[PDB]
């Protein structure tokens, strides 16, 4: 009995950054060194825990969050960062413990003519607290006049889509991001490796 990391890391489709998906994992035996030695990921940063010593440690349950963001945008997925993504789409707490992983996905996510199935929020009335989602698509109100459901001056739609082209630069190249966060609470504390 082993934890199902492969199904998460080899999924056919990935959610949008504004509607990232969550999947808790428990009651299983995990293996992190097989993931570590893949030599195919681009970034592997673990704030607070050494990646080489993950196997010799035990927790209560872990969470897996995944989405797709622009290549130049990966730098905002970190504790204590400032940016439009951190403000409006996905914010990490200051005391975050876990790892962040991201690798290029050009040949799977870029096609001729562009893929418009990935969207990111543009405006929000207030900053996001850590770890919550916002699937609302109500018209934004920039001015001091009610929009009344019509889009125009000072009334903008909150969401637009990325445009991915094979000829785009590596900076605009799509990247797939998977974030693991380890929890610790009074419990049987089942999940941990061999």
């Amino acid at each position, epitope marked *: 009995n082993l934890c199902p990391f492969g199904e998460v890391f080899n999924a056919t489709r990935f959610a949008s950054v504004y509607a990232w998906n969550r999947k808790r994992i428990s009651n299983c035996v995990a293996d992190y060194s097989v993931l570590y030695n893949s030599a195919s990921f681009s970034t592997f940063k673990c704030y607070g825990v050494s990646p080489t010593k993950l196997n010799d440690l035990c927790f209560t349950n872990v969470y897996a969050d995944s989405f797709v963001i622009r290549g130049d945008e990966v730098r905002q997925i970190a504790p204590g960062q400032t940016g439009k993504i951190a403000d409006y789409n996905y914010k990490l707490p200051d005391d975050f413990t876990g790892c962040v992983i991201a690798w290029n996905s050009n040949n799977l996510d870029s096609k001729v003519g562009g893929n418009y199935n990935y969207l990111y929020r*543009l*405006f929000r*009335k207030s900053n996001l607290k850590p770890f919550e989602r916002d699937i609302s698509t109500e018209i934004y109100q*920039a*001015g*001091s*006049t009610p929009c009344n459901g019509v889009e*125009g*001056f*000072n009334c*903008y*739609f909150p969401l*637009q889509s990325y445009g991915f082209q094979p000829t785009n630069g590596v900076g605009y190249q799509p990247y797939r991001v998977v974030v693991l966060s380890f929890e610790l609470l009074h419990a049987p504390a089942t999940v941990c490796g061999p």
Partner: antibody, heavy 121, light 109 residues
Framework: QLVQSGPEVKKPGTSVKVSCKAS????????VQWVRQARGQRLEWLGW????????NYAQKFQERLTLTRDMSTSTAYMELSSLRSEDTAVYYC????????????????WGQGTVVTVSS | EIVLTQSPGTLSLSPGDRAILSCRAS???????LAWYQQKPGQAPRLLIY???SRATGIPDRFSGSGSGTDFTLTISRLEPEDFAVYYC?????????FGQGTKVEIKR
């Protein structure tokens, strides 16, 4: 405050590009519209563009010749016109409201200094 | 579309007399997206009234807008030497934001 580029003189059939740099306020939540006026004539509306998402709207006369773009890095708005003719000689303005944060002003109070463009041979 | 026509073309009034303008449209226009601009020869236009009833920042109180529907008016209580210019009315609710033909105010002697 809005600052534009200098005057330019062109040849018929070519294309021109005018930049309208913005500073001193949150440019992310604003929107720019372009108005031109001939010598001693009435103001003429061209179009407008929302800087947040790059969406733009155009009038029917200049639908196939006018292109509006933006640059978030330098907070600069670009306007270009191709296949210029003799009657296109005028001065061009860029206007946008003063945005401080989420809330923003309800009118195009901020205006540029204008750019003189002459088309001739 | 929407067409705007300022009925009084040119008005020559000595300082002191109140002056009026009339910006009338063809179709019903939203009352929250109308404005008036002032332009002097050789300078960029300056915003005076926005929202059909409220004035801009720093505009002296003599200017005052009124009216709704297909009729809109601008009223100057008592003219001043620096208020002789051309005034345009523009609306931006619909897709084409057509301007008006303008009205010129000059000294009478």
């Amino acid at each position: 405050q809005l600052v534009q580029s200098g005057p330019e003189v062109k040849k018929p059939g070519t294309s021109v590009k005018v930049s309208c740099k913005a500073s001193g306020f949150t440019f992310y939540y604003s929107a720019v519209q372009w108005v031109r006026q001939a010598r001693g004539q009435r103001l003429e509306w061209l179009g407008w563009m929302a800087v947040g998402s790059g969406k733009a709207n155009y009038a029917q006369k200049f639908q196939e010749r006018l292109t509006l773009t933006r640059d978030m890095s330098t907070s600069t708005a670009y306007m270009e016109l191709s296949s210029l003719r003799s009657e296109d000689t005028a001065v061009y303005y860029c206007a946008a409201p003063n945005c401080t944060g989420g809330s923003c002003y309800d009118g195009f109070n901020l205006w540029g200094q204008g750019t003189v463009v002459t088309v001739s041979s | 579309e929407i067409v705007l026509t300022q009925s009084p073309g040119t008005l020559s009034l000595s300082p002191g007399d109140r002056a009026i303008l009339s910006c009338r449209a063809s179709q019903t226009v939203n009352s929250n997206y109308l404005a008036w601009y002032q332009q002097k020869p050789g300078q960029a236009p300056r915003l005076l009234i926005y929202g059909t009833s409220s004035r801009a920042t720093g505009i002296p109180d003599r200017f005052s807008g009124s009216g709704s529907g297909t009729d809109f008016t601008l009223t100057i209580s008592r003219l001043e030497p620096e208020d002789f210019a051309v005034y345009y009315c523009q609306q931006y609710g619909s897709s084409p934001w057509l301007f008006g033909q303008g009205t010129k105010v000059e000294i009478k002697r």
